[PDB]
């Protein structure tokens, strides 16, 4: 009954309002742009029509949804605001894909275990535990650096981590920020930061660059100016605003001794993560998972191929199997033999080396 009472005057009032908007809404409706916001009940507008008319805003749309430089709808002869335009373009920034929860996990690699705890404690752990950060009173590191011969576990570990962590992953290719155009490169780094802030919490994966390698002793040079001009703005963004979790940074570089200590800045980055070289046991572990996928046979001697191997990371190993698997496929058999493994192990050995040895230190 209380409802009925509100309802009796309301229904008509409800219709009347809809009639009133329709009068404004009436075709056509021209897009135009709000130049700037003059807070003493004014604003600057640029019209590509002709007439402009200073109006009071409707109550559906407010000025709190108006931003400077925004697109809005104007009528073509009473030039008034029906609504703000709701059609926005593509992020124009440098190469990015955003992905929520990727397929892969970190249970597939093995024997690498220690490194895996390091990223764990930094990134994953505060999300899991508020109050452990409160006791200590501090943030886990803003960002980490993963360093090794290009992604054989660096790349693997990142993919895995995004699923775990359950926030948006954005992967940016850093070389692509470099442009030989005066405006372009700086605009991009500032758009990259802009994009982060909206999507927060978010993970930033920075793929290695050439441009983080050079600082010299000048702060800018008559050489390629842009690479350092850009390098600086990376720093300004970082040392201007610290995140505990709003942005998490994964940085990647082939060698970290290329980097600059300016770039690190202690108290943002405290963690430097190093992939050990191939260690003999590890090779067998990594392998056992790769063979499982594939056909296997009772004439395979798993150790013998691993033993024959020395200083080869998981990628070549993943590769050997794939190569061999192709040979088999040509034979139109799904049975694997020793022979297959031998030719593939030889091809990859042939290609990496032509050097001479520095051993025999005994």
């Amino acid at each position: 009954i209380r409802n009925q009472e509100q309802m009796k005057p309301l229904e008509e009032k409800q219709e009347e309002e809809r009639s009133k908007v329709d009068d404004l809404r009436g075709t056509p409706m021209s897009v135009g742009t709000l130049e700037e916001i003059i807070d003493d009940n004014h604003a600057i507008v640029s019209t590509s029509v002709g007439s402009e008319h200073y109006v009071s805003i409707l109550s559906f749309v407010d000025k709190d949804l108006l931003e400077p430089g925004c697109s809005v709808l104007l009528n073509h002869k009473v030039h008034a605001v029906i609504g703000v335009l709701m059609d926005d373009t593509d992020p124009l920034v440098t190469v990015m894909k955003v992905e929520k929860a990727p397929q892969e996990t970190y249970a597939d690699i093995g024997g690498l275990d220690n490194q895996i705890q390091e990223i764990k404690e930094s990134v994953e752990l505060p999300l899991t535990h508020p109050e452990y950060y409160e006791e200590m009173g501090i943030k886990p590191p803003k960002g980490v650096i993963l360093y090794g011969p290009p992604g054989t576990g660096k790349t693997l570990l990142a993919k895995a981590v995004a699923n775990q962590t359950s926030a948006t992953f954005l992967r940016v290719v850093g070389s692509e920020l470099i442009q030989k155009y005066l405006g372009d490169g700086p605009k991009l780094v500032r758009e990259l930061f802009r994009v982060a802030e909206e999507h927060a919490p978010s993970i930033v994966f920075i793929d290695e660059i050439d441009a983080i390698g050079t600082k010299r002793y000048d702060s800018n040079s008559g050489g390629e100016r842009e690479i350092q001009r850009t390098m600086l703005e990376l720093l300004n963004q970082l040392d201007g605003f610290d995140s505990r979790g709003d942005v998490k940074v994964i940085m990647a570089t082939n060698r970290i001794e290329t980097l600059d200590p300016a770039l690190i800045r202690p108290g943002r980055i405290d963690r430097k993560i190093e992939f050990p070289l191939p260690d003999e046991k590890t090779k067998k572990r990594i392998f056992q998972i790769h063979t499982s996928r594939m056909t296997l046979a009772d004439d395979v001697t798993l150790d013998d191929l691993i033993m024959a191997k020395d200083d080869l990371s998981g990628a070549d190993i993943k590769a050997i199997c794939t190569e061999a698997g192709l040979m088999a496929l040509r034979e139109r058999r799904m049975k694997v033999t020793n022979e297959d493994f031998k030719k593939s192990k030889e091809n990859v050995l042939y290609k990496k080396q032509e050097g001479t040895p520095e051993g025999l230190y005994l």
Partner: protein
């Protein structure tokens, strides 16, 4: 007419004093890049030029069979191969072989010229490399030939690093993520070179 009836990117008739859609015309495309040349039919075949005979089976077996038939591979337990590189004496007939392959594969041949992706206009180059990938997916299956790193000589330039390889390198990284978030592809990358010294350490 109602809004379900329209499908984006149609040429249409709008009235001028009532501003409603009287009719919809046929459809329309756009060149965002300063050179669009896509070939859905080829300029080459097997008997395009002869003496290729030893090579035809070898490329074929590498490229066609996984795209045509994914099921056999899946069953065996191997991952799809991402991209292929061909090296040999300049533009003898090498390129032709790629175009023969796209025809057989029954896909689009998309030649993207690397240097045409970068603009002195602000931001347009950065947007361009990324933008192309999304297009191919709607177009899928497709062949992305990186054009301008070796050609017959139909199109200027043989070789180039740091902006034919560098844009191509980017593609390898986009694909690495793709490989993690899917398990069947239909996007092949074709690189052509003569030189082994145009190849970066990353490559």
């Amino acid at each position: 007419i109602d809004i379900n009836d329209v499908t984006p990117n149609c040429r249409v008739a709008l009235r001028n004093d009532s501003y409603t859609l009287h009719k919809i015309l046929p459809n329309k495309v756009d060149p965002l890049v300063s050179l669009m040349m896509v070939e859905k039919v080829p300029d080459s075949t097997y008997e395009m030029i002869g003496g290729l005979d030893k090579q035809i089976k070898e490329i074929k077996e590498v490229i066609e069979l996984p795209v045509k038939h994914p099921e056999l591979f899946e069953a065996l337990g191997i991952a799809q191969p991402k991209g292929v590189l061909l090296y040999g004496p300049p533009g003898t007939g090498k390129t032709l072989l790629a175009r023969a392959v796209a025809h057989h594969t029954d896909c689009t041949f998309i030649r993207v010229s690397g240097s045409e992706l970068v603009q002195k206009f602000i931001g347009e180059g950065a947007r361009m490399v990324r933008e192309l990938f999304v297009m191919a997916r709607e177009h899928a299956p497709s062949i992305i030939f990186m054009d301008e790193i070796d050609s017959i000589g139909s199109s200027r330039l043989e070789g180039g690093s740091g902006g034919d390889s560098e844009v191509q390198r980017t593609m390898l990284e986009l694909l690495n993520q793709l490989d993690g978030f899917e398990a069947t592809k239909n996007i092949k990358v074709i690189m052509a070179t003569n030189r082994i010294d145009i190849l970066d350490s990353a490559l």
